[PDB]
Amino acid sequence: MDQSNRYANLNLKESELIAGGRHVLCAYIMKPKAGFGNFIQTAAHFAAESSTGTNVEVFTTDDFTRGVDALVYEVDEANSLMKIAYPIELFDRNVIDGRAMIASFLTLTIGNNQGMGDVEYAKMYDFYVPPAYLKLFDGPSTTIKDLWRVLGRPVINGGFIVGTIIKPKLGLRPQPFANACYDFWLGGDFIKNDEPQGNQVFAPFKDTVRAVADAMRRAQDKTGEAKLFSFNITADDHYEMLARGEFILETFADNADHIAFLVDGYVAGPAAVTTARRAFPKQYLHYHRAGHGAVTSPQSKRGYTAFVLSKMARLQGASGIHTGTMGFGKAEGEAADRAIAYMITEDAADGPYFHQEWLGMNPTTPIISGGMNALRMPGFFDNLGHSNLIMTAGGGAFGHVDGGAAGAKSLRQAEQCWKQGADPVEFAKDHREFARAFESFPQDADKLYPNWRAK
Amino acid sequence: MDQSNRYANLNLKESELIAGGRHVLCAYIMKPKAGFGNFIQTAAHFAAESSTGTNVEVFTTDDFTRGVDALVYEVDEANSLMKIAYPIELFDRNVIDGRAMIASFLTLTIGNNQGMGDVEYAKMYDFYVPPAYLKLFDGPSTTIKDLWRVLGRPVINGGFIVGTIIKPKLGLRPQPFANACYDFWLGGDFIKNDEPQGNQVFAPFKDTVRAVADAMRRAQDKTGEAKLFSFNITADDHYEMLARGEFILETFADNADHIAFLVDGYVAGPAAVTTARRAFPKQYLHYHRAGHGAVTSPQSKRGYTAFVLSKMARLQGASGIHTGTMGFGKAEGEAADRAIAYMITEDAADGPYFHQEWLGMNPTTPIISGGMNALRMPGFFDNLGHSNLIMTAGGGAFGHVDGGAAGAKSLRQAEQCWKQGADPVEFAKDHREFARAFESFPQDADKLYPNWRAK
Amino acid sequence: TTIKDLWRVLGRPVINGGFIVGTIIKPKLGLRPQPFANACYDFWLGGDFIKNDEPQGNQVFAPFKDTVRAVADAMRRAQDKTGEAKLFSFNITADDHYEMLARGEFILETFADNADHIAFLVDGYVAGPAAVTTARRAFPKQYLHYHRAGHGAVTSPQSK
Ligand SMILES: O=C(O)[C@@](O)(COP(=O)(O)O)[C@H](O)[C@H](O)COP(=O)(O)O
Ligand SMILES: O=C(O)[C@@](O)(COP(=O)(O)O)[C@H](O)[C@H](O)COP(=O)(O)O
Ligand SMILES: [Mg+2]
Ligand SMILES: [Mg+2]
Ligand SMILES: [Mg+2]
């Protein structure tokens, strides 16, 4: 069935659709499967399955329904581009508070359209949210300002937060775990749970939370500096997430504002993210995206990009989200991913297809992680342009030859080097912990700074 | 770094790992990216990033950690096959009730390993859950038996539940919506909300719920038969899901056991599914999988298959899940997908790589939906072998030329034809609503039953 | 929840899993927390299931939380010693619905990875159907053990 006359209107102007403020706009890279309809026919069926229709005519359709159809307004077949306009009335709203839900956005814009038999593939690269819909999202309640304030840093451009992940990923019992925390905190600021750490039989949650709280008090007494921890509170059960969060805040007591809550938002879903955002709005919500690579990888021609994932996370209310190392670490990622960081931190920014005004919605911190170490950091910051962020180096800190404290100091020193505009090899001559990161990761040192041993 | 000596043990026997009952097993189709390590080296790093390690050595590792490492125990590079054994102690458990969480299973087995820079792709095709871990999952609390009991059908092999989806997908205001419900219920059993229908500004939730309750009462009075509705209660906010569910049960009153709750489990996540399973265990939980195609499509070489998604949904507690049309409808799917239906309904079944014993865990109904209609149903049932399920046909019912009631009756008659072993064209001579489905979908009739017009 | 869920925990077939060997901790009242837990451990070296005697709860000489913790320790030690799963049925009966919840929630959290080895005992005849329903609806994944103390006042054939 050809539904192009109903679901396609290529005479609509994007600038008028934006100015109108009545439509969500999505841009997709799509390819029709061979043997079905042409590009516009396939894009029109895609619009129908993403708004008001199905694959056949139904006699219950009225003119009111036709008015809320999603419309294909722009195509570019040689570049596989399809842009659709979604009337904002289509999106579901809470009965309890009239607010928006990202689950409805996902259901319509990247839901059943991902299982179409006549489409080879379709992936969302950008979306535009107008003011009338944007303002109905939670947005972040806590930001990096609240971490800077706890550290005694300026709340405007407070700078780089030196972090790590406790490694091994799993296996440390409660006291060995808190001993590694204490060691890192002698030189660093922030520690996060590795994403799966929680209530394993060999490291029960309550025993680890108590041991970590004791290690925070001892490290603050020893250094005279505030320390931060991001606990994993992810669970299927909403009530388990509440039980974990409430226990941590009570246990940390006068250090309760030093606590961030980590949620595995991609695998547990938006429902888990919203549970922590709404139950604990005064605690920094750390969005961990484990599993995202199944769709965001450039190897995938389906689902949505990491740029789209990150933009949605700001609307959901993440205080920070992992944006990757932009090609400087161990994971998939490119230098151009710096545009993701600007979209989640600025009040106005450009996406690959759509500019976005955030109307004062709070920023989401880019959390940098994945095979980072002291040696790889100057190149990373040169590409991004600032260090007003959190960087967590698990292997980079606990793989440092002189220990966790020296590991932490090598990361502190690497950002000082970049901030001072110094040559890393020349800088290392007067900074031992940074110099010893060359001997800890010699394969990286040989690649990045060829004659480092002679100097 | 080569981690194959630690994370690979190809001398482990799969039959001994199963007999031991101490490991979750996962089977993946993986391809290393060119220029990094070979197959076993890449599989070992993949196991490290999915359990206890990272991409470099860390000095916090102890022998206790090494004992809980995930291990590559079987490879077949010619078929791109990788099998990993996960010690069950790795998986997170609830502090409140000691039960398992699928978010932890997902985080470890298909989490960060999907963003590996040295892997071209990796997709999970099957998993094995031993008794010690299986018994910690919720499993389904309500089944098709409970629906059959409300319908006055036998609770053992009660038969085919004639279903539809209200179409248009969005656009009907509350009374037109309830009028389409009433019309369908004059000849059918079950109606579900189309996945995005909820609380749109043009069809407020409470007005729609009240209008549908009135239509249920009127259809039951007119026909003398029980009628069922599956309402979408999906939301980001846990408290919105509760508010929707509580309002529906109170409104339906003496018809409250005729209500199923629909959750968009793939986009809202396991957290939303668990909210409905634990808050409303006496209401049939309908798992809608909109968006799954981004990873489950055979065009994707990442994430996991629809077989894996369905198997996880039974552990999560879905009373039913959409299993697709197995190549007989409009979506991607194949005849071999009948094995998904057997895995979720039987007490013992074979997956593509692992045999699974369910230890009396309740079955999950296969919900059949996606471009189905009366004409396509006999072929669908011939491939599956039974009709003890719910089939929903939106376009197939509301696209019937004589209306929703005739649409419903054509679906009822199509399964009666299959059950009687009759020839569909000969059967249509004595069954008008079924015969009129040929005239409603003539392109389908021409392909499936060539000289139908002459007879 | 049914006997299937107890058979599954014991490693028995879920269909016709057979006899569950049980006892009641005696004295009916009087054992302090550690003597109570010592009798649990001793029985579990040869048996499967233990239930609270119907009035045992939070007596001043055997506070509930101390007894629950001592029994959880005895369950862990008996399971380690025998290599077999052990079951306990705790009395959570109370006039106050919120007391029943407080008892049940504390037990599941304390037993942790052994939380599916727990049954909840309710004195359904004296506390009434309201107490039975509190346990059934609040803890549907825990075996609900209905104790009928007092029933004999009407059920006895001596009663007409
Ligand atoms: O488990 C890990 O691998 C990490 O803790 C990094 O540890 P290492 O520092 O030792 O590499 C992070 O979870 C990943 O960076 C997540 O990837 P991403 O940030 O892209 O979402
Ligand atoms: O919106 C739709 O497209 C449907 O209502 C089918 O309606 P029609 O009968 O008119 O086609 C279902 O949601 C899809 O089948 C879900 O996909 P799946 O079952 O594969 O999960
Ligand atoms: Mg991690
Ligand atoms: Mg639908
Ligand atoms: Mg007694």
Short mmCIF file of N, CA and C in Angstrom, two decimals, chain A residues 367-442:
data_model
loop_
_atom_site.label_atom_id
_atom_site.label_comp_id
_atom_site.label_asym_id
_atom_site.label_seq_id
_atom_site.Cartn_x
_atom_site.Cartn_y
_atom_site.Cartn_z
N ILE A 367 31.01 12.69 31.33
CA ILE A 367 31.83 11.83 32.18
C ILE A 367 32.72 11.04 31.22
N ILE A 368 34.04 11.24 31.35
CA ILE A 368 35.03 10.66 30.45
C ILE A 368 35.65 9.41 31.06
N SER A 369 35.50 8.29 30.37
CA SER A 369 35.98 7.01 30.86
C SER A 369 36.18 6.01 29.74
N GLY A 370 37.10 5.07 29.95
CA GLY A 370 37.34 3.98 29.00
C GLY A 370 38.76 3.90 28.49
N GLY A 371 39.61 3.22 29.24
CA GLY A 371 41.01 3.07 28.89
C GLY A 371 41.81 4.34 28.98
N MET A 372 41.36 5.32 29.77
CA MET A 372 42.14 6.56 29.93
C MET A 372 43.27 6.37 30.96
N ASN A 373 44.31 7.14 30.80
CA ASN A 373 45.40 7.18 31.75
C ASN A 373 46.06 8.53 31.59
N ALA A 374 47.04 8.83 32.45
CA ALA A 374 47.74 10.11 32.44
C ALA A 374 48.32 10.48 31.08
N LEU A 375 48.84 9.50 30.34
CA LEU A 375 49.52 9.71 29.05
C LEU A 375 48.56 10.14 27.94
N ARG A 376 47.33 9.63 27.95
CA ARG A 376 46.33 9.91 26.92
C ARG A 376 45.52 11.18 27.16
N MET A 377 45.59 11.75 28.37
CA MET A 377 44.77 12.92 28.75
C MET A 377 45.12 14.24 28.01
N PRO A 378 46.39 14.65 27.80
CA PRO A 378 46.63 15.94 27.10
C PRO A 378 46.01 16.02 25.70
N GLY A 379 46.11 14.93 24.93
CA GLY A 379 45.51 14.84 23.60
C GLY A 379 43.99 14.92 23.66
N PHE A 380 43.41 14.25 24.66
CA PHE A 380 41.95 14.30 24.88
C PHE A 380 41.47 15.74 25.13
N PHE A 381 42.14 16.45 26.03
CA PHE A 381 41.73 17.81 26.37
C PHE A 381 41.95 18.78 25.21
N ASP A 382 43.02 18.60 24.42
CA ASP A 382 43.29 19.43 23.23
C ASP A 382 42.11 19.37 22.26
N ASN A 383 41.55 18.17 22.06
CA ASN A 383 40.41 17.98 21.16
C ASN A 383 39.11 18.58 21.75
N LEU A 384 38.87 18.39 23.06
CA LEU A 384 37.64 18.89 23.66
C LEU A 384 37.69 20.42 23.88
N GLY A 385 38.78 20.93 24.44
CA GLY A 385 38.97 22.36 24.69
C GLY A 385 38.78 22.83 26.11
N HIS A 386 38.28 21.97 27.01
CA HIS A 386 38.11 22.34 28.41
C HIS A 386 38.28 21.09 29.27
N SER A 387 38.46 21.27 30.59
CA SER A 387 38.53 20.15 31.56
C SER A 387 37.52 20.33 32.71
N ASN A 388 36.41 21.03 32.45
CA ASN A 388 35.34 21.21 33.44
C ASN A 388 34.46 19.97 33.35
N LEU A 389 34.98 18.85 33.83
CA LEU A 389 34.36 17.53 33.68
C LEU A 389 34.93 16.58 34.71
N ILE A 390 34.36 15.37 34.76
CA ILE A 390 34.81 14.25 35.57
C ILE A 390 35.44 13.27 34.62
N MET A 391 36.64 12.77 34.94
CA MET A 391 37.30 11.70 34.21
C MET A 391 37.62 10.64 35.21
N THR A 392 37.25 9.38 34.87
CA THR A 392 37.46 8.21 35.71
C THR A 392 38.38 7.26 34.93
N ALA A 393 39.53 6.91 35.55
CA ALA A 393 40.52 5.99 35.01
C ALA A 393 40.73 4.84 35.99
N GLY A 394 40.13 3.68 35.70
CA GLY A 394 40.23 2.49 36.53
C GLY A 394 41.59 1.86 36.37
N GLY A 395 41.83 1.25 35.21
CA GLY A 395 43.13 0.71 34.84
C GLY A 395 44.25 1.75 34.91
N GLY A 396 43.95 2.99 34.49
CA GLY A 396 44.90 4.09 34.54
C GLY A 396 45.39 4.49 35.92
N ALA A 397 44.61 4.20 36.98
CA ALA A 397 44.99 4.50 38.36
C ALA A 397 45.51 3.26 39.08
N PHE A 398 44.77 2.15 38.99
CA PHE A 398 45.12 0.92 39.70
C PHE A 398 46.15 0.07 38.94
N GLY A 399 46.49 0.48 37.72
CA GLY A 399 47.57 -0.11 36.93
C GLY A 399 48.85 0.71 37.03
N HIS A 400 48.83 1.84 37.79
CA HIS A 400 50.02 2.65 38.02
C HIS A 400 50.97 1.82 38.90
N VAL A 401 52.21 1.71 38.50
CA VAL A 401 53.23 0.90 39.16
C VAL A 401 53.45 1.26 40.65
N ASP A 402 53.25 2.51 41.05
CA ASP A 402 53.44 2.92 42.46
C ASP A 402 52.15 2.94 43.31
N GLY A 403 51.03 2.43 42.79
CA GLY A 403 49.78 2.35 43.55
C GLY A 403 48.73 3.38 43.20
N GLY A 404 47.55 3.22 43.83
CA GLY A 404 46.36 4.04 43.62
C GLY A 404 46.50 5.52 43.90
N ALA A 405 47.27 5.86 44.93
CA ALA A 405 47.49 7.27 45.27
C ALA A 405 48.35 7.93 44.20
N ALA A 406 49.42 7.24 43.76
CA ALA A 406 50.30 7.71 42.69
C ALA A 406 49.54 7.75 41.36
N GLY A 407 48.68 6.76 41.14
CA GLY A 407 47.78 6.70 39.99
C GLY A 407 46.90 7.93 39.91
N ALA A 408 46.26 8.29 41.04
CA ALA A 408 45.42 9.50 41.15
C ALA A 408 46.23 10.78 40.85
N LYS A 409 47.41 10.91 41.47
CA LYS A 409 48.29 12.07 41.29
C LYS A 409 48.77 12.20 39.84
N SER A 410 49.01 11.07 39.12
CA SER A 410 49.44 11.12 37.72
C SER A 410 48.33 11.75 36.84
N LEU A 411 47.04 11.49 37.17
CA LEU A 411 45.89 12.05 36.44
C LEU A 411 45.76 13.54 36.76
N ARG A 412 45.94 13.92 38.04
CA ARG A 412 45.93 15.33 38.48
C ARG A 412 47.01 16.11 37.73
N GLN A 413 48.22 15.55 37.71
CA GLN A 413 49.38 16.16 37.06
C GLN A 413 49.22 16.25 35.53
N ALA A 414 48.60 15.23 34.89
CA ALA A 414 48.36 15.25 33.44
C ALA A 414 47.46 16.43 33.02
N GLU A 415 46.42 16.74 33.80
CA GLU A 415 45.55 17.87 33.46
C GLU A 415 46.26 19.20 33.76
N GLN A 416 47.17 19.24 34.79
CA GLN A 416 47.97 20.46 35.11
C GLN A 416 48.89 20.78 33.96
N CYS A 417 49.47 19.75 33.39
CA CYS A 417 50.35 19.83 32.24
C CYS A 417 49.60 20.49 31.08
N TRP A 418 48.39 19.94 30.76
CA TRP A 418 47.56 20.45 29.68
C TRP A 418 47.15 21.91 29.96
N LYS A 419 46.72 22.20 31.20
CA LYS A 419 46.30 23.56 31.59
C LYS A 419 47.47 24.58 31.48
N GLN A 420 48.70 24.15 31.84
CA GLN A 420 49.90 24.97 31.76
C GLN A 420 50.46 25.07 30.31
N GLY A 421 49.95 24.26 29.38
CA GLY A 421 50.41 24.24 27.99
C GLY A 421 51.81 23.68 27.85
N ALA A 422 52.24 22.84 28.82
CA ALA A 422 53.58 22.28 28.82
C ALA A 422 53.71 21.06 27.93
N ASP A 423 54.96 20.73 27.57
CA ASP A 423 55.26 19.53 26.80
C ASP A 423 55.23 18.35 27.79
N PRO A 424 54.40 17.31 27.59
CA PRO A 424 54.31 16.22 28.58
C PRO A 424 55.64 15.58 29.01
N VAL A 425 56.57 15.36 28.09
CA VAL A 425 57.86 14.74 28.43
C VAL A 425 58.70 15.70 29.30
N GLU A 426 58.75 17.00 28.95
CA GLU A 426 59.48 18.02 29.73
C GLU A 426 58.82 18.18 31.11
N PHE A 427 57.48 18.24 31.14
CA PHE A 427 56.70 18.33 32.38
C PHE A 427 56.97 17.14 33.33
N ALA A 428 57.09 15.92 32.77
CA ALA A 428 57.34 14.70 33.54
C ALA A 428 58.68 14.72 34.30
N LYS A 429 59.67 15.49 33.82
CA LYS A 429 60.97 15.61 34.50
C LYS A 429 60.83 16.18 35.93
N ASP A 430 59.80 17.02 36.19
CA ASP A 430 59.57 17.63 37.50
C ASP A 430 58.31 17.09 38.22
N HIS A 431 57.67 16.01 37.70
CA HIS A 431 56.43 15.45 38.24
C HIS A 431 56.53 13.92 38.20
N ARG A 432 56.99 13.32 39.33
CA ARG A 432 57.30 11.89 39.43
C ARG A 432 56.13 10.96 39.12
N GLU A 433 54.96 11.21 39.69
CA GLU A 433 53.82 10.32 39.50
C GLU A 433 53.43 10.30 38.02
N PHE A 434 53.48 11.45 37.35
CA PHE A 434 53.21 11.55 35.92
C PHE A 434 54.31 10.79 35.14
N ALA A 435 55.59 10.99 35.52
CA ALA A 435 56.71 10.30 34.89
C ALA A 435 56.59 8.79 35.03
N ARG A 436 56.15 8.32 36.21
CA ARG A 436 56.01 6.88 36.45
C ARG A 436 54.81 6.27 35.71
N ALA A 437 53.89 7.09 35.15
CA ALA A 437 52.80 6.58 34.32
C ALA A 437 53.35 6.14 32.97
N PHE A 438 54.52 6.70 32.53
CA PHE A 438 55.20 6.30 31.29
C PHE A 438 55.73 4.87 31.44
N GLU A 439 56.33 4.58 32.59
CA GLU A 439 56.85 3.25 32.92
C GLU A 439 55.70 2.26 33.23
N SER A 440 54.53 2.74 33.66
CA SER A 440 53.36 1.88 33.93
C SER A 440 52.69 1.42 32.65
N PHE A 441 52.59 2.32 31.64
CA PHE A 441 51.96 2.03 30.35
C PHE A 441 52.98 2.35 29.23
N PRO A 442 54.06 1.53 29.13
CA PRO A 442 55.13 1.83 28.16
C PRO A 442 54.71 1.72 26.69
#
